[PDB]
Write a protein that binds this ligand. Structure first.
Ligand code: NA
Length: 361
């Protein structure tokens, strides 16, 4: 069923710069944890509650703490960290499946605060000004104060029939949090006191259709020049006018798991692992690349003008953005990849399921 490893003529030569273990990772549990990067430090976590700051250049520990709770005599109970990590201004942020959000200080890795949010936090917390936004699995948006973690406001987007796989972080633009979700809506809320600007139904309520086991739709909206791009939970790409939320168009692809925007292109990965580029204005497909079909792709990322994806066999593949052809390949880990690659400031990070963080070339 799975596609054979494509044969490639590496245009260049990729290697592991370094790699540091992080407990036992996430193994086969559902999680959205991935590495963050700020001021040449790499942060990473695992399901059980382990978190490490790393030196970006060689990945040696700067610090290392556990958030695991008390159990019986001898084990700890897993903290179940799920959304993160996110770092801004000397706090490291993580959400959990126990509906806790943690703020750890960047300096030592101590609890600055810990708050009880309104449902599970499976998506990265998102920082705007002095506000940490949390989209919970039960359709609530909450703004916590950055300093103490007190809940400044709570908004109800309306409780989803089911929760589904897929990140759903909020995104921010011009003083508004824009958020999708499993409810089939996208909403814009003003970040001052959580006032509702608009709400647009982009598909019907889940479900409403059968849920397929390969669905894993990331409903985090992306806002580029006055347009909101958002995947509905059924896999369709939609474009909305940022001002009124009114639907511009809908690409009834029905199969998309992740996409990114850059410049005048949208790049995406569908549920079958077909990769594809489209035009930003109209979302018309320019090329398609199916050689990875049914290997199991992560979401895609842009690094040094190439598209990179990981599969669950432990390879990274580099893809040419103009024609969709393979530029490079690499075997990297054997547990496999699941959560997203990360590209910031000339570093290319990725955490495998066994928990191991890599920095690439
Ligand atoms: Na996320």
């Amino acid at each position: 069923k799975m596609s054979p490893l494509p044969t490639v003529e590496n245009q260049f030569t990729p290697t592991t710069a370094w790699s540091t273990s992080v407990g036992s990772g996430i193994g086969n549990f559902y999680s959205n944890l991935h590495p963050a990067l700020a001021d040449n430090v790499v942060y990473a976590a695992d399901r059980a509650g382990l978190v490490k700051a790393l030196n970006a250049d060689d990945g040696k520990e700067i610090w290392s703490v556990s958030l695991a709770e008390k159990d019986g005599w001898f084990s700890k109970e897993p903290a179940l960290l799920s959304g993160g990590v996110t770092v801004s201004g000397g706090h490291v942020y993580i959400g959990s499946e126990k509906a806790q959000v943690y703020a750890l200080n960047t300096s030592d890795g101590t609890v600055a605060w810990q708050t009880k949010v309104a449902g599970e936090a499976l998506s990265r917390p998102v920082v705007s000004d002095g506000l940490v936004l949390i989209h919970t699995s039960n359709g609530q948006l909450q703004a916590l104060n950055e300093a103490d973690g007190a809940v400044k406001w709570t908004v109800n987007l309306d409780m989803p029939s089911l929760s589904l796989r897929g990140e759903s972080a909020p995104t921010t633009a011009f003083g508004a949090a824009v958020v999708g979700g499993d409810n089939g809506r996208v909403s814009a809320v003003l970040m001052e006191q959580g006032q509702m600007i608009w709400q647009q139904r982009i598909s019907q309520a889940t479900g409403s259709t059968e849920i397929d086991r390969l669905s894993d739709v990331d409903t985090t909206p992306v806002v580029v020049n006055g347009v909101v791009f958002a995947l509905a939970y059924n896999g369709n790409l939609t474009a909305l006018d940022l001002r009124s939320g009114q639907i511009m168009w809908k690409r009834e692809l029905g199969s998309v798991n992740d996409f990114i925007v850059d410049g005048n292109r949208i790049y995406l990965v569908d549920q079958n692992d077909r990769v594809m580029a489209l035009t930003i204005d109209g979302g018309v497909t320019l090329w398609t690349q199916s050689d990875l079909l049914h290997r199991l792709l992560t979401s895609p990322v842009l690094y040094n003008g190439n598209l990179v994806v990981g599969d669950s066999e432990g390879y990274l593949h580099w893809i040419n953005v103009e024609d969709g052809r393979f530029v490079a390949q690499q075997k990297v880990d054997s547990s496999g990849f699941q959560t997203e690659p990360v590209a910031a400031d000339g570093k290319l990070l990725i955490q495998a399921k066994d928990g191991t963080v890599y920095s690439i070339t």
